[PDB]
Design a binder for this molecule. Sequence first.
Ligand SMILES: [Mn+2]
Ligand SMILES: [Mn+2]
Ligand code: NA
Length: 346
Amino acid sequence: GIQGLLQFIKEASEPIHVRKYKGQVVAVDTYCWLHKGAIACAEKLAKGEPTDRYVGFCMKFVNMLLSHGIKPILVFDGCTLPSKKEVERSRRERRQANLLKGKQLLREGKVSEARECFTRSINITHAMAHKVIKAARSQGVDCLVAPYEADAQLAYLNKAGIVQAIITEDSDLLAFGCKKVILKMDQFGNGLEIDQARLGMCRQLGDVFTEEKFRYMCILSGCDYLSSLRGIGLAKACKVLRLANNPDIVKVIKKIGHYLKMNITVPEDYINGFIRANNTFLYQLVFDPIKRKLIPLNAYEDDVDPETLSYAGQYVDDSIALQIALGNKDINTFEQIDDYNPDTAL
DNA sequence: CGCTAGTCGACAT
DNA sequence: TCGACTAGCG
Ligand SMILES: [Mn+2]
Ligand SMILES: [Mn+2]
Ligand code: NA
């Protein structure tokens, strides 16, 4: 996500407990519980030996929310975004490297250092995620699979009024424009809340509290979609948007050396990547739970051409998008691996 | 001070 | 995977 963003807007945060959302709906970035639950059984998972410790880990987090009168909607990552296939492969190479080197550290004798190797090789698969789906649906807990990144799907559920808060550990939710983000929640509900309107409490943030300017700031500092220019962090990027009274962000990026008084050369392909990064934060395909239709995160503006937004995900038939979101259709093989039906009893 | 890139812990015995 | 945390550099 946006590295250093949580310490950058710490004034907007407030330690809370999940009881303040009793009787309300809260969506969950379930891949954070999946990863932390897999750390306990990272050895068996890396060895291919059967294990299901992570499911019980994810369930007590769900049972904790159900004990406090909260309706959780579990959201899971779906297809890989087209602009991150090279990134996912390079991360897969590191998982295979720490796996092979981890098995060699066991051959050498050290296990305390091999433990740190197997835990960095954890690959949360869709089969592991579907195990949590069947375990949660057996407890009457709703489950949903995002068309692509769960980051965008969560941002839609919060901005549409379906949920009022989002439990996660990732800071991309703030850049996507969420209303209430709950970070660092333990097994007991002790968390740290960040609201969107409460971003004004950050003095160093300046007038970059509006969603459009704040989204531009997160991108210029570097994100999953576009690396930052060397020497451009969160503070200097925030200074650019403060010192720039120009609404056109394109001319501002070209003058990034004028606002900061630095010799910064802006390549021409960086502008295109920025536009691709902004359109991805804005128009990434999510799944409407009510209407059951593929929609962008935000409604298409009259200036953008939706035909040139393939990097934000391509459309499929709504009947296929429904089965993918229900976890019945495999993300890879597109074959029916389940037959869940929510009608016969979001 | 700000930014880069690296280290390291998470879980739970 | 994601963050917190720090030495090193402008
Ligand atoms: Mn993310
Ligand atoms: Mn994510
Ligand atoms: Na940066």
